[PDB]
Amino acid sequence: DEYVQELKGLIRKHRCEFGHQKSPLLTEGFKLLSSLVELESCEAHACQANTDQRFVDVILSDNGILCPTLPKVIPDGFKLTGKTLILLETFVRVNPDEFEKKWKADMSKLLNLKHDLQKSGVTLVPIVDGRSNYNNRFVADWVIERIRWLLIEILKASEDQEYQRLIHSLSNVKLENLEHLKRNSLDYDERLNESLFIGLKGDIRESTVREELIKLKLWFKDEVFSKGLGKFKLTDRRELLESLSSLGAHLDSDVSSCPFCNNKLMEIVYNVTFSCVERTDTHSNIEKHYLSVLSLCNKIKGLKVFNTRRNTLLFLDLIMVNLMVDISDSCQDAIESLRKSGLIVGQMVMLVNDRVLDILEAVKLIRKKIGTNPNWVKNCSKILERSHPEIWHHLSTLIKQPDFNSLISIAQHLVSDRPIMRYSVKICRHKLFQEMSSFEQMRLFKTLSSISLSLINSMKTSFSSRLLVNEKYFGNVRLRECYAQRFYLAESLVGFLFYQKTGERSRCYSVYLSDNGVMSEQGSFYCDPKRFFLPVFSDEVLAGMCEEMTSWLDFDTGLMNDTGPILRLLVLAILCSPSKRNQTFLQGLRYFLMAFANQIHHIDLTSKLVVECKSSSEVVVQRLAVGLFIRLLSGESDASLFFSRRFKYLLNVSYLCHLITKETPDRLTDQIKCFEKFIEPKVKFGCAVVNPSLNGKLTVDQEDIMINGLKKFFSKSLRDTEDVQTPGVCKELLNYCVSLFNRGKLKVSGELKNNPFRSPTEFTSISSNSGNLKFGLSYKEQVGSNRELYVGDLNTKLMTRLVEDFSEAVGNSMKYTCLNSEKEFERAICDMKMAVNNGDLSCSYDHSKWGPTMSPALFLALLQMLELRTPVDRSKIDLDSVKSILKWHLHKVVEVPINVAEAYCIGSTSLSEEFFHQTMQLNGQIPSHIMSVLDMGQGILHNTSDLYGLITEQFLCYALDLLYDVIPVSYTSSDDQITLIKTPSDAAEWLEMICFHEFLSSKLNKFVSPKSVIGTFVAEFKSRFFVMGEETPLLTKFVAAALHNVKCKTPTQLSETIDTICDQCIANGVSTKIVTRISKRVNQLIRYSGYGETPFGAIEDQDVKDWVDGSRGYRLQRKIEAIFHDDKETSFIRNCARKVFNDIKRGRIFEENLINLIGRGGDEALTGFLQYAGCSEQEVNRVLNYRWVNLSSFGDLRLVLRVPTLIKTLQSKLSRQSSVASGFIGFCKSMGSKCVRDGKGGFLYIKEVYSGVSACTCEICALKPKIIYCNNSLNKVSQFSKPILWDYFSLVLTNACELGEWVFSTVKEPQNNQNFFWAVKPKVVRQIEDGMNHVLQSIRRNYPVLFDEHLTPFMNDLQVSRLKFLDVCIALDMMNENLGIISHLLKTRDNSVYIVKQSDCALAHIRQS
Amino acid sequence: LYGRYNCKCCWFADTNLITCNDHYLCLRCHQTMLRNSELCHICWKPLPT
RNA sequence: CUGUGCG
Ligand SMILES: [Mn+2]
Ligand SMILES: [Zn+2]
Ligand SMILES: [Zn+2]
Ligand SMILES: [Zn+2]
Ligand SMILES: [Zn+2]
């Protein structure tokens, strides 16, 4: 006993439970440490010391609260305040996995006892303190570590696993190559291995595999192929078109042949358009006054300057009514002339909170609260005066009785019918959209844009209360207290969108018009507002897309004249009916076209293109799409003139599905569908053990069902064709594959390089005594169908990370796998392009139910006999750890969603619902956990599944080369693959080879999807379609991506992301006329959000040279130059920038002084650079005169949605559900509140900032109105006034740093069938010497404090820290919040090639220096 | 080398083609593109005689 | 956490 006595003097170095405590000595010290940390954890939350630690029910029995026979729970710290108890159970877990596990197991165990406390007694306040460390408040956190260390040093010198379990928690911290836990058996692992590795030999010779594959081909040719049982067939394009017309073009349906009749929103758009086009399309002073006072009242609405919400709404209604009666006088006819022409409807007046209220009902409600509550106006105006003395512009509104006589006179003057709001769902007078002028169709699109913006703003309405009694959804409602969104259309008529609900849910809107006060009903429809954000301002983007697609068919003048209006009508119907069914149908049409262009396609192809309409709104879209496909494909001889253009057009028409957003119209329905897709393969297979143990101890029946599922998985013979659809794998075929892989016969060899090898006390084949690898099921929003998603606990996420890194390293050691290797993907793209150009047999294969059918047991059986030799040792590294983690994955537990369980418990026929009901009480209890053999999680074993797929596909290529004497080369991506087959010495002789490959793939777990195609005309891989001599650009896909995913947090970031999207779309040859319209749409979005127009943002009026050989900085430079026409000042600034560049490069004397000169700001830095280059104070004052209001001057805009930025990007680079419509609503909501910071911490409105401007109109405030201002025009607001020419100087200097000196020369203008597409390379000439650990040294040298704080708090490579331009072109990046050059320098081009039309390059600007 | 012995304008032709400048071209497609202009609209070069 | 912004 040498260290046992030292603890007596060691523990003395350390308020109630301490003196009582100061081989049972081990447990004594353990309890002392636990009580110490527990008292520390509770002294922060005011617990009570448990000197007895009696129970949870005894503390209620002592005080008096009745005990309803609670289960015995030991409470650490209780705080009972009269009739409310706060239970705090604390724990000390250092490792994050055990931390989260104990946290959840504590929360559940306290909620299970809070349920019975709420059933009788109090509802406890649950608190749990998850201290990840041992830091107390009694000592300096340095003695407790010594106590734990000495306790470890006294335990290590002295049940099954205690002497290591107790010290595994007192250590510092816890990858693979760790099999030293127990490696014990549980009397079930041997039965698992007997059914998982019994038929695997892996040492089969090569000649025997050759002869067996020969015999198998001979059997298949006469038993499955000659019998017609093949899964692939020739095209027979006539039959394909007939089946398309039969599945899509509904002929037995009684719906009309008119999209406007069948779609209610299309009918409303048509009504609004053709009632605004044929009719019409101090007069605007009183409307402006009403709108200003309405905005003011909407400001004091959400400020909580009153007690209740109803009183606030009544007070604002009183203000608006007083404004109405004030405007009624002092004017000859104000209401009958400008309210009828502006914002007023039949008997109703527009109020705050987007509400419209009947005037008579308004005065009826105002008579109350003033009649039953006198002296209310005085005390409700005095509380507003002393709360916001800036909105006191109300002087004659918030006054006494608002002339009730004049009010009822006004009401009886405008007595019109009320909005009906048709709630209940014929002649066809619709002008036959095909026979419309090109202006009425654009008017239809503009009307759709206005109504969609009103729909988006309807989701903006905050939750208010109804002031009237509900006299609501039966057949009709005379609206009196509905919300209304107002969209302006023409000089006199304005549209109203009435709705009675708020939030983000689907409503029943009613669209009305007001021509001159005669409120005519345009219709009523039902929709989800957050699915109508794409057309919110893209009335010209989609028109330009349709024009480009129609111009693609210019080879047949008469084909484009027919497919033009049809395409515009299809886009209009898609937009007015955003449904997942239309997305699915258009994807099916993509696959149909892919099969039509090629020669061999799956027999079950057309069975997958069918999508149940369930509404005429889907029938019209399907009819339009099928009619377009038939018009472009049907015909006898002169119908395939320019088939590349036809294929491109039809592929873009099919990718029009991306116009419809992917936001799960119903979240619970999509969760139910995800659970259905997740559990149907298991129930159909026969292994769906429910709630097995959640710990890792399966019962006898559960072990039996798992072993039966495993046996069924490997019970597929090689000479049976009635099992080519059930999940599983032939053991003998897998043995052949592994044996050919081991003896270097496949193109992927086992000779890998860079070995991938780089509380859980005891582990087994099911778990590791730290859970059971619990995942949780959810969905991922995709275009066609919602993909599966598994969110895992911390320990299971670490295990997936381990196996994924192992498999990713092995795949990097492989050759033909391209999932996380972009070099191999580009090699695959080049080989596929060469194959399509040479006429090779490209087989674009997709695999159906890859995730839901793959099993970690299959990866186990694969890895059991894989060699995987070392590069230098040749020792056959054992895969014991990887196989153990894959066994853990085989016994994983997927928690079903709680919402799905609730929806199935409160419940037509459904297989998953039937299984749920059969498991409710027939066998056990409610299902909450699902374990199974098959269904490897999508995104869980992605790299392992890719490794298996690559090995098996290389075996299949070996089999094809053996049997059919062809040259196959395959590239896989773990979901879909492409096999280029160079045939020796149509495509009817290779149908047998395709069917045999499909049969062999299905004998493994690689069921070829019916969406797979085989042919010699077009190939597809990773949604990249390659055609003979070109590549399909997919214009509609990228345009829809640019119109969608508008993640608008800050306008600068929004503009940046839109610019990158437009760059990647111009790379894939979209246009320069559609990209300028996308930029106009984004600038209009920013302008609508109240942010106003800024000299930066999206780039309008651009050429291909602004995207090719040009970055975002060059686009902003060109935008500033477009602001400054007849460039005399921008040319001078460019000359000064060239002078500075020469002095820093040619003269090479400038360093660390420009950094001192830039940190001042914009005015002083520009002044210093001008004195260093020009040195003419008159010219500097002439240059600094051009200003622009920068709202993000003293920082970033304050925003609550649903320091420089370079440091943030570097922190993100070192370390490793909401809809887009809701995001835009949050953006417009944050950019209208107090977001502009003034440096003193007081955020103010953007309107307050832009009201500080004055009408300068001195030929400097007129070259770009509301963008560029004078210096004296911003004297009232001078803090938000920065020189635009300084930003131009900085942009030009960084563009010189990045992409050459050609950015200084003046732009000279140049002195083509719209289809001459070709690839151009970026012509940049980097003067930066072309990574990491170079910018960090740059910041460290110049900025010591900014490198110390806000940067490098969690780094471990400080031992590493002179580029030509990393001192000034980094200060220009850090001081400019919208320049961002370093993020472009520490990144690749991501395009490296730009497909552009020669008609654009011939119109590009020339800027050669 | 030229194309894969297809029309390069319809792809549905591999018998009795003629080269434009770098690819092949069927007879009816050549006569259709030549009777309306002199360029190719595939390779964007003048069609042969 | 709170917006009145398509002319
Ligand atoms: Mn594919
Ligand atoms: Zn009609
Ligand atoms: Zn001016
Ligand atoms: Zn040609
Ligand atoms: Zn032809």
Automatic annotation (TrEMBL), chain A:
Active site: K102
Enzyme Commission number(s) of this protein: 2.7.7.48, 3.1.-.-
List of residues binding Mg(2+): D976
UniProt GO MF annotations: hydrolase activity; metal ion binding; nucleotide binding; RNA-directed RNA polymerase activity
Keyword Manganese: yes
One GO term (biological process): negative stranded viral RNA replication
Compartments in which it is found: Host cell; Virion; Host cytoplasm
Magnesium found in the keyword field: yes
All residue ranges annotated as the RdRp catalytic domain in the record: 831-1008
Family listed: Belongs to the Bunyavirales RNA polymerase family.
Quaternary data: Homomultimer; the oligomeric structure is essential for the polymerase activity. Interacts with nucleoprotein N. Interacts with protein Z; this interaction inhibits viral transcription and replication, Z partially blocks the product exit tunnel for the releasing nascent RNA product.
Note: Classified as His(-) endonuclease since it does not have a histidine upstream of the active site that coordinates the first cation. His(-) endonucleases display very low activity in vitro, although they are clearly active in vivo.
Protein name: RNA-directed RNA polymerase L
Lineage: Viruses, Riboviria, Orthornavirae, Negarnaviricota, Polyploviricotina
Entire protein: shown range: 2 to 1816 of 2209
UniProtKB/TrEMBL annotation, chain B:
Membrane topology: Lipid-anchor
Zinc finger region(s), RING-type: 7-43
Keywords per UniProt: Host cell membrane, Host cytoplasm, Host membrane, Host-virus interaction, Lipoprotein, Membrane, Metal-binding, Myristate, Viral budding, Viral budding via the host ESCRT complexes, Viral release from host cell, Virion, Zinc, Zinc-finger
Compartments where located: Virion; Host cytoplasm, Host perinuclear region; Host cell membrane
Signal peptide: none
A Gene Ontology term for the protein's cellular component: host cell perinuclear region of cytoplasm
Domain of life: Viruses
Post-translational modification note: Myristoylation is required for the role of RING finger protein Z in assembly and budding.
Keyword ATP-binding assigned: no
Residues where Zn(2+) 1 binds: C7, C10, C26, C29
GO molecular function, one term: zinc ion binding
Keyword Lipoprotein set for record: yes
Quaternary structure note: Interacts with protein NP; this interaction probably directs the encapsidated genome to budding sites. Interacts (via RING domain) with polymerase L; this interaction inhibits viral transcription and replication, Z partially blocks the product exit tunnel for the releasing nascent RNA product. Interacts with the glycoprotein complex; this interaction plays a role in virion budding. Interacts with host eIF4E; this interaction results in eIF4E reduced affinity for its substrate, the 5'-m7 G cap structure.
Record note on domains: Late-budding domains (L domains) are short sequence motifs essential for viral particle budding. They recruit proteins of the host ESCRT machinery (Endosomal Sorting Complex Required for Transport) or ESCRT-associated proteins.
Identification of the protein by name: RING finger protein Z
This protein's encoding gene: Z
Residues of the full protein shown: 33 to 81 of 94
